[PDB]
Design a protein around this ligand. Structure first.
Ligand SMILES: COC(=O)Nc1ccc2c(c1)NC(=O)C[C@@H](C)/C=C/C[C@H](NC(=O)c1c(F)cc(C)cc1F)c1nc-2c(Cl)[nH]1
Length: 238
């Protein structure tokens, strides 16, 4: 996160750190708890991941330093990548992780609501991008979960900013015209959480951008509202 501040413990209890153990253990991506055995993240996160056996999901984490060999985690039973996903810049950058065990809900870890299909008309004014990613282009993963309030940008306005790209309605952008506040390296897969009527909604999944927090380059996110039926298809399967 560029231009953010440290989060308080329990501030984003749906936020997870997804680690890979190959070759050595390290933070890979962010993610969101959306159900007791489900993590919603970006599909680009699994480039080169051949097995879910190398993945560890950590919930209830404020600081990366809370993670040691003795720290409990959730194994991943299955990686579900959207069928139409080719690359982040083309969209369909969405994946579900099916956990081997059930998450026990508490004040440190609980799910975020998905947006309502009746809420694609609502204008979200209180949006936050969270993650342990870099604070500048050449940096390291942050210890403490960072947060930044970012305004949502219309598709028309985001498409002007990305001449050469096709910004679809399955993408949602956010950023200040002058930059300074955004997602950066290591934040991908994490949530874009918007508070509406005192309830947090998972509006986006951190996907891509041109650099980090640049003027007239809003961060591009997976527009979660457009995938509610796909999420339900995969999570509510008979
Ligand atoms: C000690 O542990 C570490 O150092 N781990 C660590 C550090 C950095 C990154 C990691 C893991 N993940 C990966 O390399 C996984 C791959 C498959 C993801 C690539 C795209 C992703 N990109 C982003 O996070 C991203 C955005 F989502 C939006 C915007 C606007 C800008 C961005 F850079 C991104 N994440 C990182 C980097 Cl360089 N680029």
């Amino acid at each position: 996160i560029v231009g953010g501040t440290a989060s308080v413990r329990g501030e984003w209890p749906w936020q997870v750190t997804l680690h890979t153990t190959s070759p050595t253990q390290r933070h890979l991506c962010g993610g969101s708890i959306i159900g007791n055995q489900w993590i919603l993240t970006a599909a680009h996160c699994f480039y080169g991941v051949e097995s879910p056996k190398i993945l560890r999901v950590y919930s209830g984490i404020l600081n990366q330093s809370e993670i040691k060999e003795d720290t409990s985690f959730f194994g991943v039973q299955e990686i579900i990548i959207h069928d139409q996903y080719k690359m982040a810049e083309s969209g369909y950058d969405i994946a579900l992780l099916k956990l081997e065990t059930t998450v026990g809900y508490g004040d440190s870890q609980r799910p975020i609501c998905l947006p309502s299909k009746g809420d694609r008309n609502v204008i979200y004014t209180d949006c936050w991008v969270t993650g342990w990613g870099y604070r500048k282009l050449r940096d390291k993963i942050q210890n403490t979960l960072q947060k930044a309030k970012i305004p949502l940008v219309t598709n028309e306005e985001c498409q002007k900013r990305y001449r050469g790209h096709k910004i679809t309605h399955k993408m949602i952008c956010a950023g200040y015209r002058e930059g300074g506040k955004d997602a950066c390296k290591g934040d991908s897969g994490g949530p874009l959480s918007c508070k509406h009527n005192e309830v947090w909604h998972l509006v986006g999944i951190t996907s891509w951008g041109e650099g980090c927090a640049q003027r007239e380059r809003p961060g591009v996110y997976t527009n979660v509202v457009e995938y509610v039926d796909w999420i339900l298809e995969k999570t509510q399967a008979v």
